[PDB]
Amino acid sequence: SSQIRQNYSTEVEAAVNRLVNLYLRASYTYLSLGFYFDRDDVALEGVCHFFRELAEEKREGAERLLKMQNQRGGRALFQDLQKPSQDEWGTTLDAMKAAIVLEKSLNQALLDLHALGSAQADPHLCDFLESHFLDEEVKLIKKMGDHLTNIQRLVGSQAGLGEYLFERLTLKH
């Protein structure tokens, strides 16, 4: 019954709300990853920095979705935020593997929403996703795949040495 709402299905509105939840969940995951790498018994500052910056990015993603929801005349609805999947994240390798799984999950959710927008004939949504989300996920996933490759080549017969060098020479300088 919005005065402005036009060509904006209830189905898309609902899916946008679910995606917001997924992005806040991802932000929460990165916050946890960040503080894990900041533990005195883990102490990989560059890895902490990588994940803390991702927490911010995911939060910004959610906020961008919510703004758009309002611009189209939809109603934000928030749900419980489930805690991250792990309390301890193991090695940089383990963490980066978990990060790529997470981003692929987000990406597929974006792709699903794009498909719904296409089916509903909502070119504004499709443009919005294209402009602000799809390329960002692709670039991020490529960068994470890059990191994983480099971590894997390093962590050979001397795993600790490799983990230190990656953090020192690839991450946060």
Interface with a second copy includes 119 (CB under 8 A)?
no
Closest separation in Å from C-beta 19 to ligand AR? 17
Complex with a second copy: residue 11 or 104, whichever CB lies closer: 104
The structure tokens listed for 94 are 């383990």
- CB neighbour burial string for 44-77, b if at least 16 within 10 angstroms, e if fewer: bebbbbbbbebbeebbebbeebbebbeebebeee
Candidates 101, 62, 74, 91; CA nearest to 162 is: 91
Closest separation in Å from C-beta 129 to a second copy? 7
Q: Which residues in the 10-49 window bind a second copy by CB under 8 A?
A: 24, 28, 31-32, 35-36, 38-43, 45
Q: Which residues in the 78-107 window bind ligand AR by CB under 6 A?
A: 98-99, 102
Mapped onto helix, strand or coil, the DSSP state of residue 94 is helix
Closest separation in Å from C-beta 64 to ligand AR? 21
Q: Is there a contact between 103 and 140 (Cβ–Cβ < 8 Å)?
A: yes
Binder of residue 14, out of a second copy, ligand AR, none (CB less than 5 to 8 A by kind): none
Distances (CA, A) of 48 to 25, 52, 108, 169: 18, 6, 26, 14
Binding site per annotation, positions: 53, 56-57, 60, 63
Would you tell me which residues interact with ligand AR (CB under 6 A)?
29, 98-99, 102
Binding site per annotation, positions for Fe cation: 53, 56-57, 60, 63
